[PDB]
Design a binder for this molecule. Sequence first.
Ligand SMILES: NC(=O)c1ccc[n+]([C@@H]2O[C@H](COP(=O)([O-])OP(=O)(O)OC[C@H]3O[C@@H](n4cnc5c(N)ncnc54)[C@H](O)[C@@H]3O)[C@@H](O)[C@H]2O)c1
Ligand SMILES: NC(=O)c1ccc[n+]([C@@H]2O[C@H](COP(=O)([O-])OP(=O)(O)OC[C@H]3O[C@@H](n4cnc5c(N)ncnc54)[C@H](O)[C@@H]3O)[C@@H](O)[C@H]2O)c1
Lengths: 254, 254
Amino acid sequence: MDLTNKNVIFVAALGGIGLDTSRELVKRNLKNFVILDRVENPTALAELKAINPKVNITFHTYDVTVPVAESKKLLKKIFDQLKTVDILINGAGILDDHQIERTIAINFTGLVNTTTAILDFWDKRKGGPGGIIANICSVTGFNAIHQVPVYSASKAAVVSFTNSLAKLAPITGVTAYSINPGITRTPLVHTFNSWLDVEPRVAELLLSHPTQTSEQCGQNFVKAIEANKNGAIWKLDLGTLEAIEWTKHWDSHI
Amino acid sequence: MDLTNKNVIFVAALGGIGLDTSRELVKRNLKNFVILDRVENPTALAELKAINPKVNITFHTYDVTVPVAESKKLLKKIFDQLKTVDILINGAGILDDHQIERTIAINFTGLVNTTTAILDFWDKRKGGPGGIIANICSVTGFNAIHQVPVYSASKAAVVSFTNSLAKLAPITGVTAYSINPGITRTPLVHTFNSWLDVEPRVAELLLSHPTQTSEQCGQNFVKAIEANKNGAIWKLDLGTLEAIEWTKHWDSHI
Ligand SMILES: NC(=O)c1ccc[n+]([C@@H]2O[C@H](COP(=O)([O-])OP(=O)(O)OC[C@H]3O[C@@H](n4cnc5c(N)ncnc54)[C@H](O)[C@@H]3O)[C@@H](O)[C@H]2O)c1
Ligand SMILES: NC(=O)c1ccc[n+]([C@@H]2O[C@H](COP(=O)([O-])OP(=O)(O)OC[C@H]3O[C@@H](n4cnc5c(N)ncnc54)[C@H](O)[C@@H]3O)[C@@H](O)[C@H]2O)c1
């Protein structure tokens, strides 16, 4: 996949991992880079506009906890403007296991709802052109940080969901793969709440082991996009990029 | 784990898999068998009472979509009466990928919230005795039925969540294992909605392959309880019982 003159929507482009991924994407000579995020970051937006003024960067306010109808409304307006959208990147995430419902709504439900909304425009069954979805999950969706079990469970949900999207590609025309960063030095993991405070020092303990920077993660993120492998499960851990194999513990046979 | 004179709470005991598991549990000479389910099934309750009248069977109305505080209120009352609860079984589940939010709230969030509620009474850190949690998940949490990707992703979440609980047992005193039925002939899978109707015949196609009855599933369910393995991931597929090994794709090192 050649990103030149592509139309990309990035949900939550202006967060730690997002911003660094966004800096790399804008170097690729996108036609349109649409940022959907809950909160404006004018600094980050100004930066990204500086990096490559050939790219048309647009920002819409977007909370992923809104209902599908709301997402549909917003996507209609984007599709109306741009006509075609090549790539959707779902990047919204909260780490805070004192916030059980909000964790799940943002990390899992919200990702599912944006995806369901964009399938209205993409589904080949309704005559749509198909599309590519890049889901930011997490290595914690493979194997939990069990001191943040809710966070990890929500990421396990999106890894599964993403795997199922990729299997639906022949019906929907929409391919999908997950991007799963290992521990990355962003503000998200700087400090955070463990579930029932089983481990109040969970951030300090995590950053006592090998981490990666946002930038190395950013770089590998765009490489995974350009590889464009339907069904890939990308691990971006410790500055590297690798596709993991999902264990087949059971098969539905359909 | 000898079930004799134990106090068991079973969330959603009166459903297809539930009822058949409940029939086997009441044969074990429980002191107290507390059924929490959204809806009364008097027929099922009468049956269960008939099977072993030595067991004290109690029914409380319980929707798992209520807030933790609500679950805490209800559990307080139960713990008040019984004093001690040995085992909590979380069995609520809906299969219906036209109901995205409800699927996630019931299958994932609700499980997480009941668990979080009961830890108030169990957590050894608050001087509680600890406790045992049996989570009914699903083989779809290992490997999706991708025509019901939301359902599968919700079950992947609770598999993960349950694995993490088991790792937290040294801190909380609460051990936990999942029970993961293969396709079982209950009403749940008789007919159901695929996500975006990618496959309207998903039930008919699933029941064209080897299934198991509720009864064989029920029997194996109680065996897994009696094995009482913290951390176990029980597959109950095709009339059998086996613990699967979770792939270590990534380690947090904490
Ligand atoms: N940092 C890590 O170690 C790490 C590891 C694995 C996976 N992840 C995942 O990577 C992504 C970003 O993580 P990060 O380090 O950049 O965290 P971060 O705190 O820097 O920001 C994550 C992004 O989520 C967005 N967001 C949060 N709630 C939202 C909502 N309701 N609607 C829209 N956007 C919302 C924020 O605006 C931000 O842009 C998330 O999906 C996250 O869970 C992070
Ligand atoms: N039948 C299968 O093939 C199968 C396979 C694997 C896992 N499971 C899981 O087993 C559990 C029950 O499955 P089943 O086949 O017996 O389904 P079922 O339709 O017969 O009933 C499931 C139970 O969930 C309860 N429930 C639903 N919403 C609830 C809510 N809001 N609050 C409280 N309880 C609620 C129902 O009342 C019922 O007791 C679920 O976790 C389900 O997903 C089923």
